[PDB]
């Protein structure tokens, strides 16, 4: 079965592939060979009106209050908690990945410091401590995100 920890381990590859494919699409618009890599890619491509709205919110707040390498954990905890205060669905889980991507990107591009390894640990620790990983585990794991 999908354990809570198996979801946590799989989250590293899912988030890495998600960040890779989101950055690639963002660079093409500017001008996998793994099961978790396919999940990451399928979640990176989805462009409904809620995720596009989520991204607009993530960008605006980051442009207003630029995150630093020293506040990023508290910055992450606030928005990630805000995303699962009403409940837990796949749309909010994807927005979590989306915010993790915009957070790592802003610290890299504005703070001149690579932070993907730290934001990845932020996402994994948050999903572990705030029941998001077990919510995914009950649905058979990250593989359930493939066929929405």
């Amino acid at each position: 079965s999908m354990s809570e920890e198996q979801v946590a381990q799989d989250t590293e590859e899912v988030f890495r592939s998600y960040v890779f494919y989101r950055h690639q699409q963002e660079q093409e618009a500017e001008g996998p060979s793994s099961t978790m890599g396919q999940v990451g890619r399928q979640l990176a491509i989805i462009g409904d009106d809620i995720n596009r709205r989520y991204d607009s919110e993530f960008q605006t707040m980051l442009q207003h209050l630029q995150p630093t390498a020293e506040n990023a954990y508290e910055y992450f905890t606030k928005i990630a908690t805000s995303l699962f205060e009403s409940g837990i669905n796949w749309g909010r889980v994807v927005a979590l990945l989306g915010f993790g991507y915009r957070l790592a990107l802003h610290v890299y591009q504005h703070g001149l410091t690579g932070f993907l390894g730290q934001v990845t640990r932020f996402v994994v620790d948050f999903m572990l401590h705030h029941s998001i990983a077990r919510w995914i585990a009950q649905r058979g794991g990250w593989v359930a995100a493939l066929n929405l």
Epitope: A104, Y108, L112, T113, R121
Partner: antibody
């Protein structure tokens, strides 16, 4: 593929300034950082600073603030490092690098030798 | 400044043995540590990033471990192409490199 090609060797007299170039190809120059590293003969590695070519934002090793000036030309996809008031302590090999989103220096240039002598 | 200390500048190994290069940081750097190989005349090459993640094209015999302050680069089944310089690095906002460890053959 991803390539970083630096300028040719520099041989100059003390008190002069040199500007090393770092040409990028095979990726989006404006979307990745450019790191600069100094390696003295027989010695180890020393970080100088980083620049974001898209924004022109710079951070420096505090030792090199006022000594090294990092710039970038988006048109040419070339980063530049200007060293002023050259002394014997500046004689070294200078590498440019581009890090991944993690921060590790994935791609390195070949290296530019700067020799300061009278 | 964060100081990456490679306590041994020279390490003696043998072909087919395993050797570990230690690197202690002066602060907690989490897992934001990288390992680089350098051979004479050549630019450094990334081997391990994220303390333990092998970079693309790097042989399986290179492994990294550690978190916080102590980090170790372990080379299993040492080959002759592995005799080189090995630098640890923390890539926080102000990046610093370790002093390096030169690998030699025991005799």
């Amino acid at each position: 593929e991803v390539k970083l090609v630096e300028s040719g060797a520099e041989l100059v007299r003390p008190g002069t300034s040199v500007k090393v170039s770092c040409k990028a190809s095979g990726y989006a120059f404006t979307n990745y950082l450019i790191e600069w590293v100094k390696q003295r003969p027989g010695q180890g590695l020393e970080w100088i600073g980083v620049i974001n070519p898209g924004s022109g934002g710079t951070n420096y090793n505090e030792k090199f603030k006022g000594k090294a000036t990092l710039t970038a030309d988006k048109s040419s996809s070339t980063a530049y490092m200007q060293l002023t008031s050259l002394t014997s302590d500046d004689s070294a090999v200078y590498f440019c690098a581009s890090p991944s989103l993690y921060g590790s220096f994935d791609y390195w240039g070949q290296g530019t030798t700067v020799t300061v002598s009278s | 400044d964060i100081v990456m200390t490679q306590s041994h500048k020279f390490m003696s190994t043998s072909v087919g043995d395993r050797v570990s290069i230690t690197c202690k940081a002066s602060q907690d750097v989490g897992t934001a540590v990288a390992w680089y190989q350098q051979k004479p005349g050549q630019s450094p090459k990334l081997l391990i990033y994220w303390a333990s993640t092998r970079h693309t094209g790097v042989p399986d015999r290179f492994t990294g471990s550690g978190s916080g302050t102590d980090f170790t680069l372990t080379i299993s089944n040492v080959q002759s192409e592995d005799l080189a310089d090995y630098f640890c690095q923390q890539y926080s906002s102000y990046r610093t490199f370790g002093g390096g460890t030169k690998l030699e053959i025991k005799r």
